[PDB]
Subunit: 291 residues, 4 copies
């Protein structure tokens, strides 16, 4: 049993091609992902090499930086750094027609330099994360007189997410009248799918009624169709004053028949009502007798 969706809801499918690419994915399309400290290294790195190059560029021009040593790389490099940052001390003024032309070019570079560098930082850099915890398991047990598929999520930060949508989706292999076998998605209807203010915990619920794609199914039948469940969550995070997304996926064998999530809200001596996420993945079962 290989898994079509990973737990984080990434696709396992291998992709085939080697030709074109996202314009701007990389001309984030193709930096704004890797960790903060790394990001800085890269910009730092790029900052140096760029300078050390213009440095190399002045030298190959001659002894054309005043008050500089003959053909010295450090002196020049620092003049470069001193040109690009736009520090312009003066002691190291340019010389002639050429050096000066590299100057105005080098200034331009550090200017855009700064802009791009600003864009990234803001882009990140923004992309905020949702701090949403999904339960490691699902359960099917009775609620309001129906067997109900359930799972739950928690908000890991103190800030509030408002206008929160969850979508719970069955994915499985089906056969058509026409004898074609395909992979189909079903949007399980939830007792409730919109929570206007998500702040603590949320048990999402699919009553398996006669209208449910999983009516009359069992573990065995679910495994036969290699059924999986995909959960997508979204919301506007008060913290970032921005939007957030989280996904997660579950396979059949992560569905506990009969289970009940343990209550996650507590009452305490200090602070009264509380919420203990230590219990978030806890599920109760009734264990049957042996002989």
């Amino acid at each position: 049993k290989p898994r079509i969706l990973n737990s984080d809801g990434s696709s396992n499918i291998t992709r085939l091609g080697l030709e074109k690419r996202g314009w701007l994915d990389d001309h984030y399309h193709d930096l704004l992902t890797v960790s903060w400290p790394v990001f800085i290294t890269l910009i730092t790195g790029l900052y140096l090499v760029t300078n050390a190059l213009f440095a190399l560029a002045y030298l190959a021009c001659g002894d054309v930086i005043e008050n500089a040593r003959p053909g010295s790389f450090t002196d020049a490099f620092f003049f470069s750094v001193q040109t690009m940052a736009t520090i312009g001390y003066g002691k190291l003024i340019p010389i002639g027609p050429l050096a000066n032309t590299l100057v105005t070019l080098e200034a331009l570079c550090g200017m855009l330099g700064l802009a791009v560098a600003a864009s990234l930082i803001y882009a990140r850099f923004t992309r905020p994360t949702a701090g949403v915890l999904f339960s490691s398991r699902m359960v099917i047990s009775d609620f309001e007189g129906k067997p109900t598929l359930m799972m739950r999520l928690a908000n890991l930060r103190i800030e509030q997410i408002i206008e929160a949508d969850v979508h719970l989706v069955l994915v499985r292999s089906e056969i058509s009248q026409e004898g074609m076998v395909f992979r189909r998605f079903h949007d399980l209807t939830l007792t409730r799918s919109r929570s206007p203010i998500f702040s603590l915990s949320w048990t999402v619920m699919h009553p398996i009624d006669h209208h449910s794609p999983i009516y009359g199914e069992t573990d065995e039948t679910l495994r036969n169709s290699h059924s999986e469940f995909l959960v997508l969550f979204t919301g506007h995070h008060e913290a970032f004053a921005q939007n957030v997304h989280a996904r997660h996926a579950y396979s059949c064998d992560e569905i506990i028949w009969g289970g009940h999530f343990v209550d996650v809200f507590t009452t305490l001596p200090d602070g009264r009502r509380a919420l203990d996420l230590g219990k978030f993945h806890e599920i109760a079962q009734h264990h049957h007798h042996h002989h």
Copy 2:
């Protein structure tokens, strides 16, 4: 009677944990909240203690700043300030291999320095506020032949909010067939929940009909379930050319049975039609006779 939601719709529940944190909540996740004047202080402060440091850094290098006094902090500090701002007067040029290397590092810093500082300012700094006033009370009284749960809201600014949604929500403790007591959310249907152009005042209305979760309830029964009402409002503000959110919460004892909001629109000698928010929280009751 302790309150589960505060008037501002913040949650009263105590949260339990002490382990992880929002990546970027603080690496706004963890500044862009505190007041303008404060923000400036902080950046000002940071600006100083970063300079003073590099200052300390040059000194611990030796008498390595030219035209500077021996081991003087002020002179150096100013050279720092003069390096980071990228002012580069020149009179205070760096000395040797080391100082110069701190320089290029210090320039980088003030560069990102500027970018971050720009990001924050724009981030704020944006997050605009909705200037929405909620009535201090709710009422239940007859409209179009049904008892109706009502409350109202007003736009506190001259700008217009377009595409405005309100969601009015009953939260209460219920018992399931299976003898489990939980807290449930109901979306009260509104005679109208979308207002395409919100500009003045808006009375939001829940006709308590047979389909209403509060059909046949009374003050007594509402208190019994510790019922609360949560209101979320959102919209695109023409002002900021951006989105806005406001919430508020009400308990049972802020529902006035029989009350009628007072009309808030006026006709006047000058300007004709007007709107008086002075009367926004005013509610009419019929008082019954004593003996």
Copy 3:
């Protein structure tokens, strides 16, 4: 007959209060509206006064700018300009403990200076406009066998608006069973309210059927209720790769009973199919005979 909504769908109602204000409406809440050329003046202006002040600040410190004339404002001012821009020529270096402290403060100022100035520009400055033309009139005439309320809109730019929503809304004075007279909004159902790709012209249509709030109404009855129609349009503009909004309002006497918009699409010798907005406000009527 005074008008409750203006043609541009602004509210005519006078607003009453004089106490609080939008935090950031103005601390755009309270610049990013006035025209480009004006914007520049203001920043230019602000740029000068700020400098001329720090100038005044150095002087009141003494003859503390080197190579400057005694107590001269121009010299100082230029040193200020030379400090704030972070030009730092050098010929005009600061003097002592105090001047230098104004320096680091002045640099900070021009830094934020630049950031704010950047934020605004981007904010504007963004807020893009929709170039949407609304017809000066509405018409009620027969379409598909029903009298139909209609009006139309055109896209004034070459770019495309995608995902376009229009909302057409009756506003009028009504009376409740309970003898209260209020102003009510009705969302007229449109044959079609979503146009996924708005690019040329769009006649929006409300079939007055038995379900319509304006079933059996007439000019006379519409005027009695001081009925108005409010139109809100929104969409994502391909141009700005951003969102856009437009509104407009119509009173009774801008509804032409019997009228038909003139066809606005043409066929031509050159370019074949065309679209002539010169005809956009043209309406056909049948004029009855005299004696």
Copy 4:
């Protein structure tokens, strides 16, 4: 047979007018479209011709730049470049009342200069692209016992698009009871129009049932009405942490009656499950016998 919508869903219709323009379309309304390398040229170019100008401006003032040659353009130009970038070496200080006034003006320019330049870059520059491939053809064939209009789309990048909407739309010429011929849009209902996580491939499907605008139509009848199909796709791209849009259009003769898309998912020796976009446009037909 001329085509009303092109394959990319641009409109073929000629537009008529020559009077007003988008405020900011160009005052992106009217730069942020042309290719990266080009963009840089333009800013580079602009950077130069703004400097050369101020250069010309100083000269026409006299020999007013110190340490500069008499009336030399290069020297001045570089002083310009050295003023605008805010490099401020010093060796080339300004002279008198006038030069200095051009200075503070030139600094302002390079300041806004930088801000605008930063805005554009971020604006671009953002507008991210969707990397969505549409099948070159449509098909009508039986699925679940109904003839079904189908086509499919694929994600060309490794990143995921979440909350993806597709809208498939019949456009054709119709005649009203009132003998008026117009162009009408129909929203074909899809067996599924929202895909919460689009990542690989998606066959979009319109079961032609009794409720379908294309019930009982044929190639002949479709051509008669000059029917076209328009597809709009949108989604939030995880990559850019932003939104994306793609459209495409199809005419009658790009609908293959009886065809079946070839399965695009594969199983392999290495990596097991894969997806081959090489087969994306492949369609199966049953070819009938000759004599």
